[PDB]
Structure formats: C-alpha cells, structure tokens
Amino acid sequence: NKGSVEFQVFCFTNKIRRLTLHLELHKKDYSSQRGLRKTLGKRQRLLAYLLKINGVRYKELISKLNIRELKT
C-alpha cells in the first residue's frame, strides 16, 4: 500500500485501537504499554508535520478518524 501521511495515521489508529482492547484484559502487560506510547508519539509528530504544511488536510483527517486536537 501507499506510504502517505494520512495512511500512516490510519494504520496507527488501528494499531493503537487494537491494543486498547487488549489492555482492557491484560492491563499488566507493561512491555506492550511501552510500545503503545510509540505509535501514540509517532502520529503526534506526523500530525504535527501535517499541521504547519496544510491545515485543510488536518481538519479533514481528524474529522473522519475522530482525533482530539491539541491545544497550543
């Protein structure tokens, strides 16, 4: 598949969502928790890049994926 910016966020959005349901049961899996914050951080720096390059794509991507916008 492609490697566009919005596509990487879509895969992380599923990779993140897939692990939340896992931690509801295996909450003591702290090694996976260290991996969960990576994908949460990788998308943070990509969306941080998408923001200052084009705000139109930002408002459209966050709207369909139901993403919380950051203050400041």
Next chain:
RNA sequence: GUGAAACUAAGUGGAGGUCCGAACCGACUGAUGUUGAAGAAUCAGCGGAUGAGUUGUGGUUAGGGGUGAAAUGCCACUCG
C-alpha cells in the same frame, strides 16, 4: 483530561443514630415548697426532638422466678 482510565469544574439530587427550635418524650442547675396546692410538684432556664424515636389498644414472661443498653435497678406508692 487520557490511547482508555485515574483525576477534575459546574449543575441536578436531597442523604444523615445532621443543626436551630414547638408539640411529644425526658429531668441538668437554682429558687420556692418541705404538719407542702402536690406522699417528687410549681416557677425560670436546660437535653433529645426522622430516630437505638414517642404513644394508644389488645396481649406474653411470675418469685430457689421473671426482666434488666446491668443500677441490685424494676416487677400495683412495698424488692439483697
């Protein structure tokens, strides 16, 4: 607010052997009375007052016993 929670601000809600305070139930202090109006009361304040609350009617437990949030206290002005 967070990945989701923890946490956190308002509003709604009206909890409590909660607060003040009448009835009601109690009886802490003092005065008066003390051949008393009264064989424990009057007067002025005092405590609890949605509770372990108060009360009526109809019943239960009877003495080498009964009952007792236990004083040897109560059991028809009578109770080691």
